[PDB]
Amino acid sequence: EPEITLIIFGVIAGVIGTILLISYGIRRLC
Amino acid sequence: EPEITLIIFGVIAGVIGTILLISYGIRRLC
Ligand SMILES: CCCCCCCC/C=C\CCCCCCCC(=O)OC[C@@H](O)CO
């Protein structure tokens, strides 16, 4: 039942969110 | 409220997961 969909997408929004945020903290660091 | 609880956990698990993944990936792969 679609209760896991909230988890997977939350992970997706969690993984994507961290990669980009760190990539914006490193983009200056060459 | 239970839906947002599942989504938030996905984010937290996603945030902690990605941080550890690349932190334990940068230092490893030299
Ligand atoms: C950077 C990667 C981050 C990975 C984080 C992974 C987080 C996983 C979080 C939660 C996993 C829960 C797994 C849930 C496992 C479902 C159990 C099951 O099979 O029962 C199904 C029933 O509905 C049948 O009636």
Nearest to B6 among A6, A15, A17 (CB): A6
Residue from B3, B4, B12, B18 to probe the interface with A (highest A Cβ count within 10 Å): B18
**A7 ligand 1 Cβ < 6 A:** yes
This structure was determined by: X-ray
CA–CA gap between residue A21 and residue A23 (Å, rounded): 5
Q: What is the CA(A4)–ligand 1 centre distance, in A?
A: 7
Using an 8 Å CB-CB cutoff, list chain B residues near A12. 10, 14
Between the alpha carbon of residue A1 and those of residues B6, B14, B17, the distances in Å are 13, 21, 25
Buried b (16+ CB within 10 A) or exposed e, B1-29: eeeeebbeebbeebbeebeeeeeeeeeee
In what helix (H) or strand (E) does residue A12 lie, and over which residues does it extend? helix A5-26
**Per-residue b or e along A4-21, where b marks 16 or more CB atoms closer than 10 Å to that residue's CB:** eebbeebbeebbeebeee
In which residue are the tokens 């980009």 written?
A: A20
